[PDB]
Design an enzyme around this catalytic site. Structure first.
Site, PDB file in Angstrom:
ATOM      1  N   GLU A 171       0.854  -1.225   0.000  1.00 56.45           N
ATOM      2  CA  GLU A 171       0.000   0.000   0.000  1.00 56.45           C
ATOM      3  C   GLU A 171       0.876   1.257   0.000  1.00 56.45           C
ATOM      4  OE1 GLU A 171      -2.599  -0.589   3.321  1.00 56.45           O
ATOM      5  OE2 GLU A 171      -2.261  -2.836   3.244  1.00 56.45           O
ATOM      6  N   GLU A 338      -6.514  -8.185  -0.649  1.00 60.62           N
ATOM      7  CA  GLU A 338      -6.953  -8.455   0.736  1.00 60.62           C
ATOM      8  C   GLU A 338      -8.470  -8.326   0.756  1.00 60.62           C
ATOM      9  OE1 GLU A 338      -4.830  -6.085   3.596  1.00 60.62           O
ATOM     10  OE2 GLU A 338      -3.056  -5.957   2.277  1.00 60.62           O
TER      11      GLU A 338
HETATM   12  C1  LIG Z   1      -3.507   0.339   8.898  1.00 58.66           C
HETATM   13  O1  LIG Z   1      -4.143  -0.522   7.979  1.00 58.66           O
HETATM   14  C2  LIG Z   1      -4.648   0.142   6.845  1.00 58.66           C
HETATM   15  O2  LIG Z   1      -5.692   0.999   7.322  1.00 58.66           O
HETATM   16  C3  LIG Z   1      -6.269   1.755   6.271  1.00 58.66           C
HETATM   17  C4  LIG Z   1      -7.368   2.569   6.927  1.00 58.66           C
HETATM   18  O3  LIG Z   1      -8.448   1.699   7.381  1.00 58.66           O
HETATM   19  C5  LIG Z   1      -6.795   0.837   5.159  1.00 58.66           C
HETATM   20  O4  LIG Z   1      -7.373   1.626   4.127  1.00 58.66           O
HETATM   21  C6  LIG Z   1      -5.704  -0.061   4.566  1.00 58.66           C
HETATM   22  O5  LIG Z   1      -6.248  -0.983   3.574  1.00 58.66           O
HETATM   23  C7  LIG Z   1      -5.079  -0.827   5.752  1.00 58.66           C
HETATM   24  O6  LIG Z   1      -4.022  -1.657   5.298  1.00 58.66           O
END
Ligand SMILES: CO[C@@H]1O[C@H](CO)[C@@H](O)[C@H](O)[C@H]1O
Ligand SMILES: CO[C@@H]1O[C@H](CO)[C@@H](O)[C@H](O)[C@H]1O
Ligand SMILES: [Ca+2]
Lengths: 707, 704
Positions: A171, A338
């Site tokens: 991400e 995911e």
């Molecule tokens: C800390 O984890 C992240 O949190 C974000 C806010 O919920 C999500 O959008 C992401 O997919 C997730 O990986």
């Protein structure tokens, strides 16, 4: 016409489950894999945490020498023995609720300050947040890759190992986004300066676009603080363009490094953006990958779907997200890297009966593969949990490999998928509506977002009234897309950038949610669309500026539109619907020249018209509406019916959602009840007794028809 | 013991339905009222909109001369004929999605600039937002009262009439909240100056509290902009106190005017603060009424409950709100002036099956009466709606008095209430836990809220690390209160201001969520509490400052506590629970002389101790935890068990919520399933096997 994964030259539904070997007793690894396989899953997915395997600087364990659950090599062997393909995800970032997002403690203690993301003041934003192109960060990342990548290369499918895919990092930008601050690290600042010099060539050219008076490039600094002038907006727009090149530079460097190990498997990346069970900001985050997706046809992006519950409050998020991924990645299957199974947070419940409906809705909504995250619960060894000892709750398996309630839900869904995948993967929805995705409206992660600490963009200070984030969240995501899904009208989303006229002319209608600005290329494309026979619906504004807020009246002049912007009551009437509540006092008032007026202010001034232009049709509404009243659904329905677009089914309960998917052989009807009500209704196909159906709260039915 | 409404000298559950005569076809007024009575409702509630009846300046229509739906007199006669009591709400503000929030268009057109709420630059904030104490505004308000109050007096309960209660205005200060903008109208600022002069007497006194450098009160300006200095925090804190006095001045002027008509019935006000289906900000709004509630024992505040849905995501909001209202209003019944029925927003569904559960949970959670808002849908007359044509959706009745799905749910719940009210109303829960309400932490609606987008309060610029809104939202509201309710441990909340030592000594434990600041009176109260034999649980900080952020270490010195604030990993161990995630790197590390260490950082530094002080016990944790992991529930459970506090039942399923309500004769066990799961479970005290549907309930009666 559909995009789907293929296995042995046949359609294959990718069914993966996330199983973290590093958080499971290794004596139980085989039992987790066997029970995953027994749900019909073909693949297993895991992170390979850098912190877990580089136990001290230059001390590596992948064989369980120092801890049994460091035996990555045995986990890989077990996947092959249990006939599962494997997705590996070696980072460097994994997030995964792991201490320091997976980076080694020893690394974060050793790195200099200039390795970290820094705020406008030069202070460290977060002790586990690096600057992606930090020389030091990439040197250590490369040394981690030198040890984990030879193992991944050896265990690839082409060498008869189980490894079919690998995620690059995790991400990109999620940590920056959640921190609420952007990176002003000196490497970012210097790369930004080079970007600006390459873009403009001379300071006179930059000054002409920004309306600034700089003597030289040396006087220009990365924009900081609030936007007060159009010139600040221009500088931040270029900063957004730069961050898309920056993320592309990061993933390019990782990809070039990985390929040098003889790793030829499919590379992936995962898209964040769900928070509190809706995904209205995910379009912003996916927009930060625009240059990656343009430059890397061999990296498949998948979604991270975290709905948390399944109701009308979030029903539109997953479809909108799947549609926007398709628009930005039209040549790969839509899939979820995911796909929520259980909950990452104890206090945020994930019910099997919600998620089972989510899984079916996702099939209705065109998903082609997914990775249940988390299939298996974990227990963090050695204090490695970011937030506590237990990793996930309400999963398919507990950490011990006991079946929980979700196991039987996943088995049921997977059984339907395996029976139907040959036809279902080849099915399409008949979309007669195309919705335009104008990426520049989404380029605000540095200045305006739900997560950013400081609001830097106040459009009123620039003499504008249509905020691009308000437009794309409330008029588009929560408005038009939510409306069309609720009304059971199929739509597609098309990226307007370098868009083929040919790829718009198959639709009965094109809908454009427009701000006061839009680039010359897009204004010209929409002009040609209508002149050549296209039917265009455009609101709330005819744009008159370009992306730098300089004059651009191409579309206004090609459509022969004259308007004045006037203040009036929020309420208008449109197509005979009275008291339509609109978002802005200001509205575009049109001359009725060579047009039919179809919308009126409280003073009966014309704020919407219909016209014939060349072979095409134009409908302009000079007012903003999303979906915050019943009048708004009435208005969307009226607009759709202008081109005689019909739903596929007559359903007696307007609150029942359906999707019809078909090919030559097969028709699947998906019924989705997003409401806490047992609903008994009847339906029929809109072209020929009605069938009766009872559907539980927050539940689904699937009907298959042969032919 | 309990506070409840009374009818015919017996406990009476107030069951009211909101029916806006001005939004309903008058031919169907009698039909609406009959269908409302047929649910077992005893009262009907409505606004009387100023805009709707003063059709032009000094032209009043209460008899339907100009529009049949302006016949207020006839609506009142129909309530009488259909044997419903009447709650009237004449404003002057009604909100109610009514154009101009209920103020006449002719009034807003004719008022001077200096009748309006002004931003710091002297610009009108909103063309429908007047200054509450504007001479012009009160002049026209009084003229509206001169016409509507004689009608209300004539039909009041003190004259045998159907009108039993009247609301004054509507959600006072809700516009300063929703915008975060304070009124800087010169008359408001002149009143703020009088307040400051009256409070400090001399500029030398104020300079010593604020650390300011004024030569006189003439140099004093209303605070604006971001808090950069401790002197700005001080000025903003008194600006908050000032607005509490300001709203009490406004509601006192309205009340004296009303009483002048011989109106002797119960006066009411309504508390806002729910948004997006949770109420974590409602405690802030209720704190704005602290001076009203102090000075008017005769005005009953009711809650405006807007849950939107009913799940574990918001289960804790309604109980925490009911418990806080009980704290600030102990002598009146807890009730909902607006109790969600249908939805204000078409796109925000309100399922009959959700609201039915919410209604029963509200009984579990101590509600003594409510007004279904909206019982009847409305159609906005002639474009007078703020939004579209329709007012509310999925109500009990549509605007044409068609029964909808909610009607049968409300008739079911009302039948249960009428059958049980005599015993149920006289029941309480047995709370052995008391949670302190420290109102100064809540006094931030001008500088820090969910609805202010540009935060004026950044405590790190003041040398502090514990933000009072983060503390009261995440550590208290969504953390400790959510955790106790989830664990099925009864708690009461107590207002710490002028708090009686004796009304703390009934509890086995008092829990205090403390920032780095706390006034001398509260520090003294808690010192005495433990010395005289009380058990205190205090986290995440021993306070060292007063409300003006000047040194105050009464509690710290009385308890012989010494600490250093040091940075560590977010995770601690506490009572042998490993990996407790805490909010802050900075923690208090305690000298453990004459103490037992019970919590440790990752480097094994002491961040929590237990201690005997006089006859009592002290548990201090130098770290902040809410409820974001299973370890947090384990820690709350360990803390409660320090004084051997037990739940009322053993229930086999930990995710079933229960409330036991008893008096000497009767027990009610409310089982509540806030989860999308059919749950089968058994229970026994500290034929016993039960099935509850998703998002549903079961009530068990036991004779004692
Ligand atoms: C800390 O984890 C992240 O949190 C974000 C806010 O919920 C999500 O959008 C992401 O997919 C997730 O990986
Ligand atoms: C504008 O209407 C008000 O909205 C607030 C925000 O949701 C609520 O807290 C109030 O009770 C309601 O009266
Ligand atoms: Ca000591």
């Amino acid at each position: 016409s559909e995009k789907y994964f293929v296995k042995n030259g046949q359609p294959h539904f990718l069914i993966s489950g996330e199983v973290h070997y590093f958080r499971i007793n290794p004596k139980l690894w085989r039992n987790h894999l066997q029970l995953l396989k027994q749900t019909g899953a073909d693949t297993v997915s895991t992170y390979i945490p850098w912190d877990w395997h580089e136990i001290e600087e230059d001390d590596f364990d992948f064989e369980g020498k120092t801890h049994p659950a460091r035996n990555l090599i045995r986990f890989i062997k077990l996947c092959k023995e249990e006939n599962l393909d494997l997705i590996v995800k070696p980072g460097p970032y994994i997030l995964a609720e792991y201490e320091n997002q997976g980076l080694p403690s020893w690394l974060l203690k050793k790195l200099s300050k200039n390795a970290f993301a820094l705020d406008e003041n030069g202070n460290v934003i977060s002790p586990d947040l690096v600057s992606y192109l930090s020389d030091e960060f990439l040197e250590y990342t490369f040394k981690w890759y030198d040890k984990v990548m030879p193992i991944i290369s050896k265990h690839q499918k082409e060498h008869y190992g189980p490894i079919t895919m690998m995620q690059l990092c995790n991400e990109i930008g999620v940590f920056q986004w959640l921190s609420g601050k952007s990176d002003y690290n000196p490497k970012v600042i210097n790369l930004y300066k080079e970007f600006i010099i390459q873009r403009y060539k001379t300071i006179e050219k930059l000054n002409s676009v920004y309306s600034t008076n700089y003597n030289s490039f040396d006087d220009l600094k990365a924009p900081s603080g609030k936007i007060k002038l159009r010139s600040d907006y221009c500088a931040y727009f270029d900063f957004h363009l730069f961050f898309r090149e920056y993320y592309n530079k990061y993933i390019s460097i990782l990809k070039n490094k990985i390929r040098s190990f003889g790793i030829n498997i499919k590379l992936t990346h995962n898209i964040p953006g769900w928070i509190y069970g809706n995904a209205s900001e995910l379009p912003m985050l996916i927009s930060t990958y625009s240059e990656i997706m343009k430059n890397h046809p061999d990296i498949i992006f998948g979604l991270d779907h975290i709905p948390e519950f399944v109701s009308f409050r979030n029903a539109h998020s997953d479809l909108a997200c799947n549609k926007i991924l398709e628009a930005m990645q039209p040549e790969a299957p839509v899939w979820a890297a995911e796909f929520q199974a259980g909950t990452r947070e104890h206090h945020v419940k994930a019910y099997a009966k919600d998620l089972e409906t989510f899984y079916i809705a996702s099939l209705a909504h065109g998903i082609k593969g997914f990775n249940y995250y988390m299939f298996s619960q974990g227990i963090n060894p050695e204090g490695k949990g970011f937030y506590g000892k237990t990793f996930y709750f309400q999963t398919a398996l507990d950490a011990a490999s006991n079946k929980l309630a979700l196991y039987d839900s996943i088995k049921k869904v997977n059984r339907f998928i395996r029976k139907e995948q040959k036809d279902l993967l080849r099915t399409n929805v008949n979309s007669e509506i195309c919705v335009g995705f104008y990426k520049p409206y989404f380029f605000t992660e540095l200045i305006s977002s739900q997560l950013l600490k400081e609001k830097k963009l106040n459009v009123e200070e620039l003499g504008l009234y249509i905020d691009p984030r308000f437009l794309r969240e409330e008029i588009l995501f929560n408005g038009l897309l939510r409306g069309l899904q609720t009304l059971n009208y199929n739509y597609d989303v098309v990226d307007l950038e370098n868009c083929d006229l040919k790829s718009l002319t198959a639709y009965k209608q094109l809908w454009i949610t427009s701000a006061e600005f839009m680039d010359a290329e897009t204004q010209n494309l929409l002009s040609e669309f209508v002149l050549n026979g296209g039917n265009l619906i455009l609101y709330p504004a005819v744009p008159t500026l370009d992306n730098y807020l300089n004059r651009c009246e191409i579309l206004k002049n090609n459509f022969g539109i004259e308007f004045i912007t006037k203040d009036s009551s929020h309420k208008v009437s449109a197509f005979g619907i009275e008291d339509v509540f609109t978002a802005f006092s200001k509205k575009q008032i049109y001359n009725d020249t060579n047009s039919k007026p179809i919308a009126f202010t409280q003073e009966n001034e014309i704020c919407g018209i219909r016209k014939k232009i060349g072979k095409g049709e134009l409908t302009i509404l000079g007012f903003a509406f999303g979906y915050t009243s019943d009048e708004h659904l009435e208005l969307i329905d009226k607009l759709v019916k202008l081109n005689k677009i019909k739903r596929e089914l007559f359903v007696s309960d307007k609150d029942i959602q359906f999707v019809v998917r078909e090919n030559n052989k097969s028709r699947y009807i998906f019924f989705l009840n997003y409401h806490n009500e047992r609903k008994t209704f009847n339906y029929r196909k809109s072209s020929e007794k009605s069938e009766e159906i009872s559907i539980a709260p927050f539940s689904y039915k699937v009907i298959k028809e042969n032919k």
